[PDB]
């Protein structure tokens, strides 16, 4: 009586149940694991807070309306302030982590709409100015708020044009990245497990984000007659196999 | 025959002949069998 | 290898063509799941689509130019193209660039070919024979200032001398600092509020510098350098969506404003053929 | 001294030749490789992942909407969409498949075309997708369409339908750039019965459509893509 | 091997020289069936009549020309021969053509040799040294528009750079779409009422493009390109009647009107020697 | 570096010589051969088929 | 010795030494013996 | 080859970090004598610092 | 005479290449080596000897 | 393969792979053990 459909994920002191899942994706078919010695470089023993950092943090909720263009969060940024995960983050020189991402959106059998939930490794954004204008730090570190693709261009911020993925590629091809759809008629959640993907064994958690999670409405939300025209979307994310190394004074970052 | 000492100096590599699209085409956690229902 | 097996009528409870794309998988459906097929063999291996093959041919990555002329009274050799340099990079010319950016991280050895040809746009009695001396100047090395500085001694820095009209060829191991080169980097060099964003910070590999060894003849000679790059021993990770809009800058993803629709509009209906 | 003779071609530079060269950095030790998920070995590995087709090409500036094929409730017998199968041009051209095919001169193989339905769960519909092999015109009505490769799709719990365009061909390779002799057919879709919405519901519903290549597929003779060009070298 | 065996007088009921040609056979009659012969050996193998040998020597297949000159103010490089191309084909020059069309289908690898020589028809101080860059542009590739377009980057397209006066040589596998190249094709590309008829529809293999890499000197330089083609690994099917009338077009069988009698008229009688 | 000497004829192009060359299309896979009746191997095979002689050349 | 990797790059092929004119000179359905009458 | 071995807390009478430089020696002290380390390998031979290489171009 | 083809790079001088050359002094016999204390093999050997740092740079 | 007769004409030497800093880092007459007191 197991269905692909019902699932339970327990991680730390927190549990999620979905009764309307559509399997789960594990990026590149690899599950998060700690850093092996053969791959290690820094000689420091690392710190593995385990259950105090590897639990589920639910970010603040978004509201899908007929005019929504899509939202974008960066990792580990989105979690920069969650509990002890965040403290560890500002206090060590280097850290490394994988995540379980669970995006939630329920409706009824009269609604229609379909969101794309995708994880993009190394999502370098484009400046809407063109040329070689850079995208300032603050703009690519929105924190739990994430970036709202239907917000206005700002100065020093990225471009927010959806048919171009914020980088000069077409929305249609985002499907080459680990992703899952939430089609109100099928699905009510999306779950993706992200292994740590980098060109170095461990890195800085503040100067470099290693994935952007993106939720994009593709088939517009259509509510039943005289229904309220909107649904909330909630994102809950859990660091998994986290390791921190090179402890010290506590980083100070712009803004 | 390599005439040179360093590995960078050798010619192109030879075909992976690796080929396994499943990391890209089927990264699902619970295995899906073709023919069985997608969602049970 | 069979490309298609023989398959006949079906009346089952087992439907391989109905799936749920919401899952993120592309189910491996074949012609024989939905029509009646006959056996056929592949006769093919997929040899020429190997990434080593795809990135393994020489591509032009840079065209520069230097001239041989009397430096007498020149206050800025660099500025007179008495010698010139190049801030090495592989993203400046954009044919090879789109190919590499199909991947996120890439690792390979490089084979460089350098072709140099001379031009004599204004009245010369003859064509002189010039020797070029392109030398690699890595980060933190005395950058050269005149076309005949102590720098050109290049006692510790690899340099090649070849003749204009000829070609020079040599191969450099993968010089990246990390395990792969980042084709993309969503980071900064540090957490400052105004520091540049991109790879340019990451991929700063020092520059290459060219000059003519010959002193000047009576006429002036323009020498134009073309650098070709061939990846050998390629390794590529994490495929990405291909580049759709035009490029504007080395190292940023930025596209031009008021660009044009990249998807061709139908001449007719959705229903049109 | 061993006697030699040099042949025609000596001194040429062929960008496609593969030989040894001296290393400029003798004895240098590259950084160790660490493990990174996601390694690609063949472009054939990636063109099997499906991506969305902007089938609804009828707009005037690129929009998220050209990915949506609309469906109308209560129409009978009528046609949902049509397209030829020049995978290197037209709707296909910006898709990952289209985009890679363009790096090669010839292609052969089967294509997989699937449609995922997004209408309310309490609605229902039966569509017919038809592949018309080279030699006939794009079908003009379902009767015409139904006599070639087709699948009646019944919209249900299982949200997507995967149609295969089996390789139908005299010549074993076709050109990726559209060519007549080498042309591959048409793909059309019609109401089999009709879309029906539940009460309290209204308007258009949309289908999303994807394209990917079967394991069947072959691409050969690499060349340059018409999809990218430039007028001056970029700088930093 | 015996070329003739010894044979003596015959008075038989078994007549090998009477046959019925209406049958379509050529009965294998020998000297020894009708005169008295002596033994003799062949001393010969028929080596130099092998089709590999017959089609295996280089033949000139194309002569084109490009010039190096100041492109300043040229509105159409292609038109100034600032670079030129060639719509690859093997039927344009007709010596090699008659040889190939002795067969219906032919399959082979090609070895190309390209000789480039320069001419300076009007007053120059000297002869410059130019590098040519012939590059293969297959069907559906950005055709080049100026002599120095992004196209010439040729990041994915094989190109060779050699010097004028020298020769370039490389070999291309059999690139046909079918199992053999059709020397003839009695068909159309589709059943339209006005579409071209012949092979030109079939044998459209894309074109080859040449240019000089050098910028301009003070004088102008004419470079004339000659492409030679040698078949290697030849396979030929279905022999046909040799070409009798002159050729008029690449790819059609058409002969010129009011052509001249191709059979030599006797100077004398049927009875004449 | 192995010492060599080049002989007279170096650099010449003889249309009849038979040597190896680099392939411009590294790794390309040609179309499979299918069977076709009629293969010719030697011109000596075909000159044994008889054909008509315009003997009456007097026109 | 081939110095190159691809087959197209090898020199000319070597003599068929096949030679069988009968597909061209005697494509008759019922075998004709020299010396026996052509038409019986 | 290990570049660093794994080493944990220490509370000893054996102090490798106190020396007398007046002796003229450079005592071979390592990270693992004064912090807690994890194993890591060298992955490197020191090829390009050989004097033959240094004076050989 | 063995057929050859020369590749791109022929005739170049790369200051970092390592090949054989004819000896200008054929048959000459170098002075014997005697023992000398102090041989260095790697620069890695010497950067492990400590030296003083002008830390007080303020002059 | 050496093509030449004299030893000077051969290419560069090959890595010492000798490496022993103690003549430079620990030339002390009485051996010092790390961890034992420097001056007893
Ligand atoms: C990504 C990415 C990859 C690359 C290429 C890096 C190549 C390493 C440095 O390149 C050179 C170039 C020239 C020479 C040289 N030595 C003597 C003459 O030229 C040495 C290294 O650039 N960006
Ligand atoms: C019949 C028949 C047979 C042929 C010849 C076909 C040859 C294939 C394509 O030819 C070329 C030519 C040049 C190059 C080339 N690459 C780099 C420089 O020139 C490649 C393929 O043409 N018609």
Q: Which helix (H) or strand (E) holds E98?
A: helix E94-100
d(CA E244, CA E255): 9
Buried b (16+ CB within 10 A) or exposed e, C96-112: bbbbbbbbbbbbbbbbb
Residue E99 is classified by DSSP as H
For A1-255, CATH gives 2.60.120.20
The whole-angstrom distance between residue D8's C-alpha and the CA centroid of its chain comes to: 43
Q: How far apart are CA A123 and CA A125, in angstroms?
A: 6
Q: Which two three-digit tokens encode residue A197?
A: 């993907």
Q: Where are the alpha helices (DSSP H) in C223-265?
A: none
- CA–CA separation, C259 and A128 (whole Å): 12
Pick the residue whose CA is nearest to atom 1 on ligand 1. C181
What is each CA distance from J34 to C10, C254, H18, I48, in whole angstroms? Answer: 80, 57, 9, 16
F neighbours by CB contacts (3+ pairs under 8 Å): C, D, E, G, I, J
| CB–CB contact C120 E130 (8 Å) | no
Instruction: Give yes or no for a cis peptide into D160 (omega within 30° of 0).
Output: no
Beta-carbon count within 10 A of C178 CB: 17
β partners of residue D42: C50
Contact D99/A at CB under 8 A = yes
Picking from H6, A28, E163, H41, the residue whose alpha carbon sits closest to that of residue C167 is E163
Give the neighbours of chain J: at least 3 Cβ pairs within 8 Å: F, H, I
Give yes or no for a contact between C31 and D109, defined as CB atoms under 8 angstroms apart.
no
Largest CA distance in chain B: 61
N- to C-terminal Cα separation, chain G: 58
Q: How far, in Å, CA of D32 to CA of D24, rounded? A: 20
Residue A92 to residues A32, A46, A251, B34, D38: CA-CA distances in angstroms? 20, 10, 8, 47, 28
Cα–Cα distance measured from residue A42 to residue D115, given in angstroms and rounded to the nearest whole number:
49
Q: Which ligand 1 atom lies nearest to the CA of residue C158?
A: 17
The H or E element that residue E55 is part of is: helix E51-55
Instruction: Determine how many CB atoms are found less than 10 A away from the CB of residue E175.
Output: 24
Q: Which of E114, E118, E111, E7 is nearest to E57 (CA)?
A: E111
Q: Which residue has the tokens 């103010």?
A: E73
Domains of chain C, first to last: 1-273 (2.60.120.20)
Domain that holds residue B16: 1-40
* Alpha helix positions (H), chain B: 22-25
Nearest residue to A222 via CA among D200, J12, D193, D41 = D200
- The helix/strand/coil state of C152 is helix
Please state, in angstroms and as integers, the Cα–Cα distance from residue C56 to each residue in A40, C51, C99, C264, I10, following that order: 31, 8, 11, 32, 21
Instruction: Give domain limits for chain A.
Output: 1-255
| Cβ pair A38, A80 in contact under 8 A | no
Which H or E run includes G24?
helix G22-25
CATH number of the domain residue G20 falls in: 4.10.80.10
Question: How far, in Å, CA of E64 to CA of E116, rounded?
Answer: 10
Q: Which of residues 168-227 of C touch I (CB under 8 A)?
A: 168-170
CA of E162 to the centre of ligand 2 (A): 18
- For residue E6, CA distances in Å to C82, E32, E35 come to 88, 8, 10
| Boundaries of domain holding D23 | 1-236
Q: How far is the CA of C86 from the centre of ligand 1 (A)?
A: 11
Shortest Cα distance, chain B CAs vs residue A7, angstroms: 11
Alpha carbons E270 and A163: distance in angstroms, whole number = 85
Resolution limit in angstroms?
A: 3.0
Residue D73 phi/psi, 5° resolution?
Answer: -65, 160
In the Cβ-directed half-sphere of D59, how many Cα atoms lie within 13 Å?
Answer: 16
- Structural biology method used: X-ray
d(CA H32, CA E265): 107
Cβ within 8 Å, pair F15-E263: no
- B-chain residues within 8 Å CB-CB of D159? 38
Closest-lying ligand 2 atom to the alpha carbon of residue E183: 1
Number of domains in chain G: 1
> Which chain H residues have a beta carbon less than 8 Å from that of D25?
48
Q: Which residues contact A191 (CB under 8 A, 6 or more apart)?
A: A7, A9, A18, A21, A24, A25, A100, A101, A102, A103, A180, B29
**In the block, residue with structure tokens 């080498």:** D182
Q: What is the residue whose two structure tokens read 């409405």? A: A217
CB pair distance less than 8 Å for I12 and C166: yes
Tell whether ligand 2 has an atom less than 6 A from the beta carbon of residue E88.
Answer: yes
- A 10 A CB-CB count for C152 gives 17
Which residue is it, tokens 């009659």? Answer: E29
The CA distance from C7 to the nearest CA of chain B, in Å, is 15
């430089």: which residue's tokens? H21
Residues of chain C contacting F24 with CB distance shorter than 8 Å = none
Q: Please work out whether the CB of residue C136 comes within 6 Å of at least one atom of ligand 1.
A: yes
Best mutation site among E155, E161, E205 for ligand 2, i.e. most ligand atoms within 8 A of its Cβ? E205
3-state secondary structure of C270: coil
**Residue C266 token pair:** 């139908």
| Cβ–Cβ under 8 Å, residues A68 and A146 | no
J37's tokens: 């007191």
Asked whether E209 lines ligand 2 (CB < 6 A), one says no
What residues of chain J lie within 8 A of the CB of H34, using their CB? none
Structure tokens, D52:
């969305």
Q: How many CB atoms lie within 10 A of CB E61?
A: 22
Position of tokens 């096949």? G18
For every residue of chain D, DSSP letters joined together read -EEEEEPTTTT-EETT------BSSTT--PPPP---S-EE-BHHHHTTS-EE--TTTTSSS--GGGSEEEE-BT--S-EEEEEE--TTSGGGGGSHHHHHHTTEEEEES-EEEEEEE-S-TT-B-EEEEEEE-BTBPPPSSHHHHHTSEEEEEE-SSS-EEEEEE----SSS-EESS--STT---EEEEEESS-BBPPTT--S-EEEEEEEEE-TT-EEEEE---TT---SS----
**Cα E49 from chain centre:** 18
Token couple for E57:
């020597």
């Amino acid at each position: 009586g197991y269905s692909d459909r019902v699932q339970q994920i327990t991680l730390g002191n927190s549990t999620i149940t979905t009764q309307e899942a559509a399997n789960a994706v594990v990026c590149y078919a690899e599950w998060p694991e700690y850093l092996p010695d053969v791959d290690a470089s820094d000689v420091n023993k690392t710190s593995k807070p385990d259950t105090s950092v590897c639990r589920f943090y639910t970010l603040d909720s978004k509201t899908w309306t007929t005019g929504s263009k899509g939202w974008c969060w960066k990792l580990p940024d989105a979690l920069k302030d969650m509990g002890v995960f965040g403290q560890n983050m500002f206090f060590h020189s280097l850290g490394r982590s994988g995540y379980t991402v669970h995006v939630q959106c329920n409706a009824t059998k009269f609604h229609s709409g379909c969101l794309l939930v995708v994880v993009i490794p190394e999502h370098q954004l484009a400046s809407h100015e063109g040329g070689n204008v850079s995208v300032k730090y603050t703009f690519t570190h929105p924190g739990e708020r994430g970036i709202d693709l239907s917000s206005a261009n700002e100065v020093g911020g990225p471009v927010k044009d959806v048919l171009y993925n914020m980088n000069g590629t077409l929305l249609g091809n985002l499907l080459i990245f680990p992703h899952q759809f939430i089609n109100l008629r099928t699905n009510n959640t999306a779950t993706i497990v992200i292994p740590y993907i980098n060109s170095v064994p461990i890195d800085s958690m503040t100067r470099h984000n290693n994935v952007s999670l993106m939720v994009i409405p593709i088939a517009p939300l259509t509510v039943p007659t005289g229904a309220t025209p909107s649904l909330p979307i909630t994102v809950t994310i859990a660091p998994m196999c986290t390791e921190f190394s090179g402890i010290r004074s506590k980083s100070i970052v712009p803004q | 025959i390599n005439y040179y000492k360093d590995a960078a100096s050798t010619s192109s590599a030879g075909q992976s002949l690796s080929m396994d699209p499943s990391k890209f085409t089927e990264p699902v956690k619970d295995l899906m069998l073709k023919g069985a229902p997608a969602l049970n | 290898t069979v490309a298609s097996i023989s398959s006949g009528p079906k009346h089952t409870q087992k439907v391989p063509i109905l799936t749920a794309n919401e899952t993120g998988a592309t189910m491996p459906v074949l012609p024989s799941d939905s029509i009646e097929t006959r056996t056929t063999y592949m006769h093919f291996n997929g040899s020429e689509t190997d990434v080593e093959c795809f990135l393994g041919r020489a591509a032009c990555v840079h065209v520069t130019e230097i001239q041989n002329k009397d430096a007498t009274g020149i206050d800025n050799h660099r500025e007179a193209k008495l010698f010139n340099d190049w801030k090495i990079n592989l993203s400046s010319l954009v044919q090879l660039r789109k190919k590499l950016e199909l991947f996120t991280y890439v690792r390979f050895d490089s084979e460089y070919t350098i072709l140099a040809t001379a031009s004599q746009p204004d009245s010369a009695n003859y064509s002189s024979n010039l020797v070029v001396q392109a030398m690699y100047v890595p980060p933190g090395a005395p950058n050269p200032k005149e076309w005949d500085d102590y720098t050109w001694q290049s006692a510790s820095n690899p340099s090649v001398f070849f003749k204009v009209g000829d070609t020079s060829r040599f191969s450099v191991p993968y010089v990246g600092l990390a395990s792969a080169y980042n084709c993309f980097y969503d980071g900064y060099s540090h957490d400052d509020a105004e520091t540049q964003y991109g790879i340019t910070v990451l991929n700063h590999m020092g520059s290459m510098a060219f000059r003519i060894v010959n002193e000047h003849d009576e006429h002036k000679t323009l020498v134009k350098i073309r650098v070709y790059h061939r990846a050998k021993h390629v390794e590529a990770w994490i495929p990405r969506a291909p580049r759709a809009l035009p490029y504007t800058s080395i190292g940023r993803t930025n596209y031009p404003k008021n660009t044009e629709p990249v998807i061709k509009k139908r001449k007719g209906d959705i229903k049109s053929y | 001294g061993l006697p030699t003779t040099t042949l025609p071609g000596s001194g040429q530079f062929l960008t496609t030749d593969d030989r040894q060269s001296p290393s400029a950095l003798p004895n240098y030790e590259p950084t160790p490789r660490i493990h990174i998920p996601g390694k690609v070995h063949n472009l054939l590995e990636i063109i099997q992942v499906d991506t969305l087709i902007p089938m609804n090409n009828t707009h005037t500036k690129d929009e998220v909407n050209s990915y949506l094929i609309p469906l109308n409730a209560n129409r009978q017998n009528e046609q949902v969409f049509g397209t030829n199968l020049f995978i290197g041009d037209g709707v296909f051209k910006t898709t990952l498949l289209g985009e890679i095919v363009q790096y090669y001169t010839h292609w052969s193989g089967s294509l997989r075309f699937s449609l995922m339905y997004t209408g309310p769960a309490l609605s229902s519909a039966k569509l017919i997708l038809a592949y018309t092999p080279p030699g006939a015109r794009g079908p003009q009505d379902r009767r015409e369409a139904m006599l070639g490769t087709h699948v009646v799709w019944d919209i249900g719990l299982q949200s997507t339908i995967v149609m295969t365009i089996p390789w139908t061909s005299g010549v074993q390779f076709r050109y990726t750039d559209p060519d007549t002799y080498t042309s591959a057919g048409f793909l059309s879709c019609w109401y089999q019965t009709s879309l029906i919405l539940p009460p309290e519901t209204t308007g258009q519903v949309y289908l999303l459509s994807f394209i990917s290549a079967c394991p069947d597929f072959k691409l050969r003779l690499m060349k340059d893509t018409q999809t990218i060009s430039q007028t001056v070298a970029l700088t930093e």
